[PDB]
Amino acid sequence: YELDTKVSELSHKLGSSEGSNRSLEEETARLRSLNQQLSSSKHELEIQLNEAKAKVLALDEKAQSQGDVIEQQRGRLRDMEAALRQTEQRCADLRDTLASAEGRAKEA
Amino acid sequence: DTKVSELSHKLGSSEGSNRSLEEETARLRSLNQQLSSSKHELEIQLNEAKAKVLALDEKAQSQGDVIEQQRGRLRDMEAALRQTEQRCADLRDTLASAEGRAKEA
Amino acid sequence: KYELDTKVSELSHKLGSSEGSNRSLEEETARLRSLNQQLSSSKHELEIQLNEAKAKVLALDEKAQSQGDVIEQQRGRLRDMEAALRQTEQRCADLRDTLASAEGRAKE
Amino acid sequence: REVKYELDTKVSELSHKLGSSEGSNRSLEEETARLRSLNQQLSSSKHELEIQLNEAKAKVLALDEKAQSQGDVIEQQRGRLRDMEAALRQTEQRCADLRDTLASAEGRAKE
């Protein structure tokens, strides 16, 4: 009788153990799948971030050079504007002198 | 007996699977909670963003309007400047001639 | 000797309870898994849509900053030219007065 | 008797089949543990990578808008520089012509 009882509790504990085993196998399968998906996403995001940071470097380079050109050409513009102001001044003076000489010639 | 033992076994596996199922149902319910909340948040941010796009597009049209209008005004102003400058040059010549006439007499 | 009959009957009963329970739970896990795949799908879709929308917002806003800078610059040039025009008009009027003087006292 | 002999054999086999099953269970529990670890740090890494990617994308949009704006300004500036080079050349030439007409006029005034 005692051996029958021990056979019984043993068969029960065994059944529970095997059922827990199928649980754990199913769960490791699920977990491996999800890990592969997540590592794939991580790798993809890594590639995209590297690309984006590179584009940041390139565009920052281009922008800085562009800024220096804008400043350079702003200076060139002020210098030109001044050169033209002065040349125009010389022309106005000449035209005054010419017009005055016309006045005296007609007065003669 | 032999069949209290085979039945003890089948009951053991039954309770084991029962635990596995309860644990998986709990995990799933929690995950649906997470994804549902996440999806509601995404919806909020998406509607906010769509609204912002419409507003910003509108303002882009307004700003583009005033930029064009101001371009046209700058062109008109350059024109009026050119014409006035020319008038001044003509006046200055008439004057200079009158001053030569004065200096001769 | 009758403890056999009571024990076996007890165990068969515990089985039909544990397995009503079980097949019910299996139903719930299948249903929940379905709702999940649909939620992950819709979440993914919303992620694509939101990312496009966020990019559009950002680009629009940056171009608005740019347009504002252009507006302010234009108004500055416009005011500078307002002053320049007013000054040139005043110069012409001055030359007109001076002209009336030179004529007036040349006639003298 | 012989029956107790069979029962002993059955208790033995059940005991060691059980022991084996528990061994498998502890191993699988360890594997499931480390797997949930990797899951957690992979997903956390993913969240962080998303945040960083979003910030970098925004920086690209700002930088690109800057480069296009500066492009327009550069082209407009070059335009006004061209026009002004031409206008300066023409004004210098016009001044030279004025000086020449001046010389000839004064020469005529002495006649």
Author numbering:
A (entry chain A): 7 to 114
B (entry chain C): 10 to 114
C (entry chain B): 6 to 113
D (entry chain D): 3 to 113
The authors write:
Centrioles have proximal-distal polarity and a 9-fold radial symmetry imparted by a likewise symmetrical central scaffold, the cartwheel. SAS-6 proteins comprise a globular “head” domain at their N-terminus followed by a long coiled coil that mediates stable protein homo-dimerization (Keller et al., 2014), and a disordered C-terminal extension.
In contrast, structures of the CrSAS-6_CCMiddle fragment, resolved from two different crystal forms, revealed parallel complexes featuring extensive interaction interfaces between coiled-coil domains, within each crystal’s asymmetric unit. In CrSAS-6_CCMiddle crystal form I, resolved to 2.34 Å using SeMet-derived experimental phasing two copies of the coiled-coil domain in the asymmetric unit interacted over almost their entire ∼16 nm length. They do so by associating into a parallel coiled-coil complex, the formation of which does not perturb canonical domain structure; for example, the coiled coils do not unwind or adopt a tetrameric coiled-coil arrangement. Rather, complex formation relies on ionic and hydrogen-bonding interactions interspersed along the length of the coiled coils, and is very weak in solution. In contrast to this prediction, however, reconstitution assays with CrSAS-6LD produced abundant cartwheels, similar to those generated using the corresponding WT protein. We surmised that amino acid substitutions that remove favorable interactions of the symmetric CrSAS-6 coiled-coil complex do not affect cartwheel formation in vitro.
